[PDB]
Coordinates of C-alpha atoms and ligand atoms in Angstrom, one line a residue:
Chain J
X17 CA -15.2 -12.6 24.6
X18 CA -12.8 -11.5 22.2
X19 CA -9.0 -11.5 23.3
X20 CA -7.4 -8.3 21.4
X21 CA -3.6 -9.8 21.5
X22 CA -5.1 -13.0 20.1
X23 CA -6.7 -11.2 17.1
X24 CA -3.2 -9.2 16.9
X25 CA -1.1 -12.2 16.2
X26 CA -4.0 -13.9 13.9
X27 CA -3.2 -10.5 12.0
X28 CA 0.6 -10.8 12.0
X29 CA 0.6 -14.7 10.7
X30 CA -2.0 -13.1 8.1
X31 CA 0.7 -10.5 7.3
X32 CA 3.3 -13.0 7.2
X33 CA 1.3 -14.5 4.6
X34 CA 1.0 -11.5 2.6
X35 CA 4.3 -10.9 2.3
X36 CA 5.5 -13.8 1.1
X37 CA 2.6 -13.9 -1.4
X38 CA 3.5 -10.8 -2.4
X39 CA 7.4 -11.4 -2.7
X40 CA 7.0 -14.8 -5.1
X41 CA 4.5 -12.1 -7.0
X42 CA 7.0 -9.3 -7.4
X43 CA 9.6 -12.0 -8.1
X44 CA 7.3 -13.6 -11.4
X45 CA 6.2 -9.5 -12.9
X46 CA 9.9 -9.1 -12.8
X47 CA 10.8 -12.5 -14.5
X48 CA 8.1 -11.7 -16.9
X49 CA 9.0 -7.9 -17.5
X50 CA 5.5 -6.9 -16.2
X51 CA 6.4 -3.2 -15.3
X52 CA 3.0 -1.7 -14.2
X53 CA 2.2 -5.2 -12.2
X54 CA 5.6 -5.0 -10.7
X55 CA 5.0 -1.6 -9.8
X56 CA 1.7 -2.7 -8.3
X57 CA 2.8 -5.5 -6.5
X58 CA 5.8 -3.6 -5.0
X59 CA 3.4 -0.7 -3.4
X60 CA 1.2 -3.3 -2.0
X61 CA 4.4 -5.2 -0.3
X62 CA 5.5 -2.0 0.7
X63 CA 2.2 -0.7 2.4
X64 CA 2.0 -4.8 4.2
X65 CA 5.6 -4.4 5.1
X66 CA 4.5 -1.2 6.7
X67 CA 1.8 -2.7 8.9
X68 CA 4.7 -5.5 10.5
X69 CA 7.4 -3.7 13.8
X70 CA 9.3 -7.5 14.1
X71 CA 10.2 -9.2 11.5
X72 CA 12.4 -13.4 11.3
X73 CA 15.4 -13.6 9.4
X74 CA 13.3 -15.1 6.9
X75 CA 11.2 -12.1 6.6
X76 CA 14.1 -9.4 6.1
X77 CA 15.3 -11.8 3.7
X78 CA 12.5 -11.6 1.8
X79 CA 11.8 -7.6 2.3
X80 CA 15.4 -6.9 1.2
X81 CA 15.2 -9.1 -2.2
X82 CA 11.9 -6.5 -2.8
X83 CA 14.2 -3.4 -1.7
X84 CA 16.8 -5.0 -4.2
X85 CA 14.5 -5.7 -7.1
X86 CA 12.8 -2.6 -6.9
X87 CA 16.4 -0.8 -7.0
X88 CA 17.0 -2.8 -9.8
X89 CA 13.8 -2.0 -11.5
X90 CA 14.8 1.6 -11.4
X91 CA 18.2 1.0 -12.5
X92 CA 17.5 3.6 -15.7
X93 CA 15.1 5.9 -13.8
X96 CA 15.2 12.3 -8.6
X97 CA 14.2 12.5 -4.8
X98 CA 16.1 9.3 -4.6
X99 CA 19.0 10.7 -5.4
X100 CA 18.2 13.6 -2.5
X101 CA 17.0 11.1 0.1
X102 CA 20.1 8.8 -0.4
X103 CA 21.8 10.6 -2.7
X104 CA 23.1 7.8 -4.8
X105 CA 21.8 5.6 -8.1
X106 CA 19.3 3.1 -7.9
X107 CA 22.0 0.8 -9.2
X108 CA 24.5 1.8 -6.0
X109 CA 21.7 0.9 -3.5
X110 CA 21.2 -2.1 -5.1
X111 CA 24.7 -3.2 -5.0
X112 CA 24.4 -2.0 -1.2
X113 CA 21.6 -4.1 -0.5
X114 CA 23.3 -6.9 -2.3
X115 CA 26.3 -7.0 -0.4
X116 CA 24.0 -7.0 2.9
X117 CA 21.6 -9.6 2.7
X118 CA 22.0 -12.9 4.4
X119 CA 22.7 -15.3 1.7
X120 CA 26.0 -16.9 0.0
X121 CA 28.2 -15.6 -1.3
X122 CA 29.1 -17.7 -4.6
X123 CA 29.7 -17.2 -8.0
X124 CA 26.5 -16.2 -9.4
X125 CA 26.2 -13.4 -6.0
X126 CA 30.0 -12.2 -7.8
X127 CA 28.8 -12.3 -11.1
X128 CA 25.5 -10.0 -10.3
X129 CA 27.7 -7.9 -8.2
X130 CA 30.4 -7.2 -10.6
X131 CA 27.3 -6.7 -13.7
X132 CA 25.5 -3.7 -10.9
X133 CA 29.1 -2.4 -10.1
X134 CA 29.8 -1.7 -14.1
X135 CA 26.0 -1.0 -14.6
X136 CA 25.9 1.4 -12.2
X137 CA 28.4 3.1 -14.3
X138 CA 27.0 2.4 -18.0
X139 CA 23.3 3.7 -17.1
X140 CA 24.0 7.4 -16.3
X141 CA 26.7 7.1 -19.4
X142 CA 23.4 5.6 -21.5
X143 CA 21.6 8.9 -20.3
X144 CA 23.8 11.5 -21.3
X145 CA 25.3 12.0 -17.7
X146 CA 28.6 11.8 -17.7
X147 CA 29.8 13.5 -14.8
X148 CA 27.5 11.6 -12.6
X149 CA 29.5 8.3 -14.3
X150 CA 32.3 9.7 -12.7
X151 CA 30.6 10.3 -9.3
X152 CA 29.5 7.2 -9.5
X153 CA 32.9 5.6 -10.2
X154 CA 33.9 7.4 -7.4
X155 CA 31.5 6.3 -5.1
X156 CA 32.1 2.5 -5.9
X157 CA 36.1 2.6 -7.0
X164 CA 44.5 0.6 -9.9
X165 CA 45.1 -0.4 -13.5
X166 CA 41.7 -1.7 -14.5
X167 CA 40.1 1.1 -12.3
X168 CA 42.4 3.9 -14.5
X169 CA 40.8 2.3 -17.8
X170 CA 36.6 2.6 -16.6
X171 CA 37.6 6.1 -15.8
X172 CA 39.5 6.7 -19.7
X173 CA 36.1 5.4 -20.9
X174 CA 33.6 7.0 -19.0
X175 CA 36.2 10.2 -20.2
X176 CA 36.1 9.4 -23.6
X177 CA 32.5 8.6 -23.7
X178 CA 32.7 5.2 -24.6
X179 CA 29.5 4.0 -24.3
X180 CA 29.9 1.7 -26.3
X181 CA 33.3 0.2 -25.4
X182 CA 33.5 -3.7 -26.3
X183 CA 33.8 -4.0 -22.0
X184 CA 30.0 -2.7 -21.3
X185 CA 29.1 -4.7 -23.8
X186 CA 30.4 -7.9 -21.9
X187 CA 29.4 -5.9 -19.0
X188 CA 25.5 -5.3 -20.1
X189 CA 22.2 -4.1 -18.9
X190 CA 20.6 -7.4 -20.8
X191 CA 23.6 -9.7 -18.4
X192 CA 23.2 -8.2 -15.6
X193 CA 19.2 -8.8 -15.9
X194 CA 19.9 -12.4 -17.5
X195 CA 21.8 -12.9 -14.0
X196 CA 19.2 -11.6 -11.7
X197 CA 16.6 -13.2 -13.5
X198 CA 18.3 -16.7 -13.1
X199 CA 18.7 -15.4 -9.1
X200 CA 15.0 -14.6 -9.0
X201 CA 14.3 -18.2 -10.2
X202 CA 15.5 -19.5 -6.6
X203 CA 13.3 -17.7 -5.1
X204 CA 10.7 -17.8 -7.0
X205 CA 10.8 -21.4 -6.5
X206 CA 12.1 -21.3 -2.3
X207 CA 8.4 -19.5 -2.2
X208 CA 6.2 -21.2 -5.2
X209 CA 5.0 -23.4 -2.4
X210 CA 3.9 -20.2 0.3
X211 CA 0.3 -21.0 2.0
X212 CA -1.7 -18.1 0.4
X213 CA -0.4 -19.1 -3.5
X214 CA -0.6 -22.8 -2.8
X215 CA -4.4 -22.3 -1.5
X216 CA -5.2 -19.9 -4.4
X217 CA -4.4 -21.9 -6.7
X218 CA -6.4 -24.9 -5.5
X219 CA -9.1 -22.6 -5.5
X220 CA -8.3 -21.8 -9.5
X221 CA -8.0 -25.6 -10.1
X222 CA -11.1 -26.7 -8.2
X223 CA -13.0 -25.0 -10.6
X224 CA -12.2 -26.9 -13.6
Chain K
X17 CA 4.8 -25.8 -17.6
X18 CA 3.1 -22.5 -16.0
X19 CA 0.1 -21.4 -16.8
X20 CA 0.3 -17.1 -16.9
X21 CA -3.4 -17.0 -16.6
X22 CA -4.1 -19.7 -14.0
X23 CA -1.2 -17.8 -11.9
X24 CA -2.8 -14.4 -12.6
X25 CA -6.3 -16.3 -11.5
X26 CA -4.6 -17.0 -8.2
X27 CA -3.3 -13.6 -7.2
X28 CA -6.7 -12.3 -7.7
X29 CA -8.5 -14.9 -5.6
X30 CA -5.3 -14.4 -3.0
X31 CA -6.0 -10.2 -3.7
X32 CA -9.7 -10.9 -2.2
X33 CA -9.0 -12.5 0.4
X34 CA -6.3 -10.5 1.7
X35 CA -9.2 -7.4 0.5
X36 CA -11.7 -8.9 3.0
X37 CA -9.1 -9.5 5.7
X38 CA -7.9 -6.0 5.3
X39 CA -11.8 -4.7 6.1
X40 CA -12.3 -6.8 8.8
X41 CA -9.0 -5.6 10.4
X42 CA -9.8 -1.7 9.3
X43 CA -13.2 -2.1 11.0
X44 CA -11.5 -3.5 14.1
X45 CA -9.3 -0.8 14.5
X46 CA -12.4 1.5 14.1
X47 CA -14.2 0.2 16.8
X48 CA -10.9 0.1 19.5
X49 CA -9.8 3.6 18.3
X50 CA -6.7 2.4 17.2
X51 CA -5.6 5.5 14.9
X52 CA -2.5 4.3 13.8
X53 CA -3.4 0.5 13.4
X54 CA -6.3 2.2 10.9
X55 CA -4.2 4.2 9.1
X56 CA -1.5 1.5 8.3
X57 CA -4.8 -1.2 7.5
X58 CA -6.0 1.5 5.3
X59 CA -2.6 2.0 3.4
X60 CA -2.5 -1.3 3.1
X61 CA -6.1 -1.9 1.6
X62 CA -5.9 0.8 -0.8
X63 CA -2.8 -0.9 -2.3
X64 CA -4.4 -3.9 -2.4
X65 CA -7.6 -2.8 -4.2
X66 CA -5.3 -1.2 -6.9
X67 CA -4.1 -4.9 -7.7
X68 CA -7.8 -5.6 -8.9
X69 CA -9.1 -4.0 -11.9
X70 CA -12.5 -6.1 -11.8
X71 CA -14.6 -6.0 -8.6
X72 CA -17.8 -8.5 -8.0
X73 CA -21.1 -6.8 -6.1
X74 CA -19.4 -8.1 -2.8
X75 CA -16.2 -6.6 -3.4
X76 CA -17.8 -3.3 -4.5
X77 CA -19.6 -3.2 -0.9
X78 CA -16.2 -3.9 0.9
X79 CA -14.1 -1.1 -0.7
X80 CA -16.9 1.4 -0.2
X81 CA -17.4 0.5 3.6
X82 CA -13.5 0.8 3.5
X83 CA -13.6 4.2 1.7
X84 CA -16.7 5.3 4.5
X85 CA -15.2 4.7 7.2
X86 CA -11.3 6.3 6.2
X87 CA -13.5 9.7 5.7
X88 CA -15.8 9.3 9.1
X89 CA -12.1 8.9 10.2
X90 CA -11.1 11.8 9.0
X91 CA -13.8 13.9 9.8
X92 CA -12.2 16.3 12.3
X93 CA -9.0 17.0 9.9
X96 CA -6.5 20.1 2.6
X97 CA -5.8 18.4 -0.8
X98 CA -8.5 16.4 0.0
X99 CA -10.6 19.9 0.2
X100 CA -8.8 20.7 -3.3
X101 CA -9.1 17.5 -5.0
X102 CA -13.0 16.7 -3.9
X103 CA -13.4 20.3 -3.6
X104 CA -16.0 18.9 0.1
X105 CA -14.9 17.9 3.6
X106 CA -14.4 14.1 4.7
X107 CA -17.8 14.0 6.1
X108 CA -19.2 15.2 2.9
X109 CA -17.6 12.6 1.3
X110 CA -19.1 9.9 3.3
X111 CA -22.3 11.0 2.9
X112 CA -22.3 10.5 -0.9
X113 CA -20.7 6.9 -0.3
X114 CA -23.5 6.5 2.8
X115 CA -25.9 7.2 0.4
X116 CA -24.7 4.6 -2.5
X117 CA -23.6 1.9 -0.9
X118 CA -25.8 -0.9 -2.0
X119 CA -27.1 -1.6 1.3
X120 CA -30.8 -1.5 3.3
X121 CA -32.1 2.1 3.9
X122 CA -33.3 1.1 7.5
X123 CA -33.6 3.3 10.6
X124 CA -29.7 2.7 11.3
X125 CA -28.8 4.0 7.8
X126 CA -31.4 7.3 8.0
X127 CA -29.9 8.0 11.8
X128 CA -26.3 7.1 10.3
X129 CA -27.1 9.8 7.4
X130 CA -28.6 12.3 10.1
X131 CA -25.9 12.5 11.8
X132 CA -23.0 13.0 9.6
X133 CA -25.1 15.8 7.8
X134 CA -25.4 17.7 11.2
X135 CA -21.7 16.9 12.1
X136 CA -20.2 17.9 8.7
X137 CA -21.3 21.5 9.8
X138 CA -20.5 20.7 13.6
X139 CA -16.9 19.6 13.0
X140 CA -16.3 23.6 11.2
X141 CA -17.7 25.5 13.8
X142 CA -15.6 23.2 16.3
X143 CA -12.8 24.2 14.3
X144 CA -13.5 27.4 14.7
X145 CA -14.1 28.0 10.5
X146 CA -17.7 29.5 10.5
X147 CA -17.8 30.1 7.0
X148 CA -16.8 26.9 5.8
X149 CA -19.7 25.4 8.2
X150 CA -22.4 27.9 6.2
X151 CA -20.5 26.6 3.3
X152 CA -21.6 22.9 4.0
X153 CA -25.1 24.0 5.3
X154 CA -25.4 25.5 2.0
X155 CA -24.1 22.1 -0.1
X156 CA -26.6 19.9 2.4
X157 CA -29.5 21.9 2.6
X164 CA -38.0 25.5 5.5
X165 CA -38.0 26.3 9.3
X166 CA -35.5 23.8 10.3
X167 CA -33.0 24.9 8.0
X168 CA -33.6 28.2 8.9
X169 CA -32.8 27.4 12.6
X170 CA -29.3 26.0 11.1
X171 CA -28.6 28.5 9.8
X172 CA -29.0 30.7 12.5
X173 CA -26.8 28.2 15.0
X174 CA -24.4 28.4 12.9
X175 CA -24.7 32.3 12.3
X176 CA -24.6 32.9 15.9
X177 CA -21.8 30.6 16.7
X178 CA -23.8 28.7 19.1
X179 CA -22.1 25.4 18.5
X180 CA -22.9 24.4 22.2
X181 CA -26.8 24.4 20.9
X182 CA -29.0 21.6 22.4
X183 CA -29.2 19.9 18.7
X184 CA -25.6 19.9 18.4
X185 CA -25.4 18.0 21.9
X186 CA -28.2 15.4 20.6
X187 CA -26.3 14.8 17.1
X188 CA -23.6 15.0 18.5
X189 CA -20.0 13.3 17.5
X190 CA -19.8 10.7 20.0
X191 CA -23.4 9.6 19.5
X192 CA -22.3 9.9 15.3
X193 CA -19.5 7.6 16.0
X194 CA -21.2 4.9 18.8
X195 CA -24.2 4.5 15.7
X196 CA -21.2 4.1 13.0
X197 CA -19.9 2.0 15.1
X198 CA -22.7 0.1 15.5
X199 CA -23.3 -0.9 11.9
X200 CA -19.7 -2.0 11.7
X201 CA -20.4 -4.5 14.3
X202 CA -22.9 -5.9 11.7
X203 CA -20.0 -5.8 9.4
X204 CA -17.3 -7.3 11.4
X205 CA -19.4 -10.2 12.5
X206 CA -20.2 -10.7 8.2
X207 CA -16.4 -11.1 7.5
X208 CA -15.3 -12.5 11.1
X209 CA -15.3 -15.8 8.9
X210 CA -13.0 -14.8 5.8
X211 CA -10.4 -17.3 4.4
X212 CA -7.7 -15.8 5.6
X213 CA -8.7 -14.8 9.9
X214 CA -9.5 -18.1 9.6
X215 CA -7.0 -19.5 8.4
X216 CA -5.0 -17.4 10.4
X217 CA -6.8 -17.5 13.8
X218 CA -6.3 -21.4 13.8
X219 CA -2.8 -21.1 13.8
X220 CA -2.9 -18.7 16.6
X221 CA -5.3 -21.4 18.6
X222 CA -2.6 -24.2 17.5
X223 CA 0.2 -22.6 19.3
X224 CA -1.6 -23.3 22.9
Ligands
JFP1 C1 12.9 2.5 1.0 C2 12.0 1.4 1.4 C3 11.7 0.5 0.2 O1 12.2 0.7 -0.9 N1 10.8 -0.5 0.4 C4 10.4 -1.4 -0.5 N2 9.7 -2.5 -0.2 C5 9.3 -3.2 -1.3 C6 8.4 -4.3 -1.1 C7 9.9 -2.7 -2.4 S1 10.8 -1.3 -2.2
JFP2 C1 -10.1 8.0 -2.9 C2 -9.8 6.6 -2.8 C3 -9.9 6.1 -1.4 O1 -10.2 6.8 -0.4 N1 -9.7 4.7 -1.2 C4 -9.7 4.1 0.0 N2 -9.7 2.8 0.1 C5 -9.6 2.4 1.4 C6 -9.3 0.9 1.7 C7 -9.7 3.4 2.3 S1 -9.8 4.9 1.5

């Protein structure tokens, strides 16, 4: 009675779903700087995610702004850095400059904030040769005076401070507000929150 | 203009819904054997059920008939053995036996047969001690008669062939028919299934 490849795609549009739920949820803890429900969110996207083998363009778009976020998340966070032996930061900027979306001036601004970041985090932790492998990795005359500073230790050079931590999350924020509003409107938040409204 | 709490009252109905749907799916993949299809469904339920930190009666029921049947799973398969200090089917037993659910001639044959298969599985394994070990955390002259089955590596006994695995698994499998015909209904196979049917 019951036809198994029938039930398989019911599952898949049900995943679908998920995912997108889950993405616009991800998207609002890190807007709201809710670390333990970001965290939360991102293993349950991670574990749906999992349970998908084909995926739209829509839907590596959306997985790849999670893989981004989550990189950027862990921006100032060790087996990363043996499984891809590079920064959070670095494989953000690698996801950045992969996903399927325009390239304007807000995707150069974020981009040029993660490239200096990437940089400014390890020097923030007391890691100073790994600014310079870093540098390395990523990188004139301009390029000549990063590498004085990061060699001088100037943390606090008036350049990271244009270049900052709190920009370059002002900047993603104000990305994540697209999104956030592209998927405000996904079937499982706009039935939830009839739901929350009907009663009442 | 957003309401934090409203939104957070949204992702919680959404994260029982997609709870539910996740059991139904995890019971499916139960009943066709689908080993790998259960063991992505149960990743994905266990993240889920972390994204809830209150649980109604209901919910309680559906993360415990979750948690049975990802140890009756595992029943033939070490941290687990470190961390709970018992084997899988051990485990099930205690949820069996606390579940809030009717005590009824299914549930006492159920409960009869995992208690015989959690020593059966050992000496199928070839670990003899291990199955005195369970006998011992289990548990006339009947006992006695265990005992000696188990001392005389006679795992081929008549008993062991009538509580036997596959008749363990066809009664499990059984009750979560029961089960899957409760939550065939849920918001979101529904939901899901009718865009499956649109398509045709
Ligand atoms: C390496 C895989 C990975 O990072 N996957 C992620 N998916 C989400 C949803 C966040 S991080
Ligand atoms: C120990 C916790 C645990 O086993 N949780 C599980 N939840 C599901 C959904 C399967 S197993």
């Amino acid at each position: 009675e019951e036809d198994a490849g029938l039930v398989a795609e019911a599952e898949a549009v049900a995943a679908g779903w998920m995912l997108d739920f889950l993405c616009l949820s991800l998207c609002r803890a890190f807007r709201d700087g809710r670390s333990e429900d970001f965290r939360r969110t991102r293993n349950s996207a991670e574990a749906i995610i999992h349970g998908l083998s084909s995926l739209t363009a829509c839907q590596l778009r959306t997985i790849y702004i999670c893989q981004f976020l989550t990189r950027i998340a862990a921006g100032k966070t060790a087996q990363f850095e043996n499984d891809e032996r590079i920064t959070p930061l670095e494989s953000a900027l690698m996801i950045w400059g992969s996903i399927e979306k325009e390239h304007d001036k807000l995707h150069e601004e974020i981009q040029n904030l993660i490239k200096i970041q990437a940089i400014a985090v390890c020097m923030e932790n007391g890691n100073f040769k790994e600014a310079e492998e870093v540098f390395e990795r990523i990188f004139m005359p301009f390029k000549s005076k990063l590498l004085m500073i990061i060699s001088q230790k100037d943390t606090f050079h008036s350049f990271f401070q244009h270049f900052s931590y709190n920009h370059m999350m002002e900047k993603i924020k104000s990305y994540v507000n697209y999104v956030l509003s592209e998927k405000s409107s996904t079937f499982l938040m706009k039935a939830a929150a009839k739901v929350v409204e009907s009663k009442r």
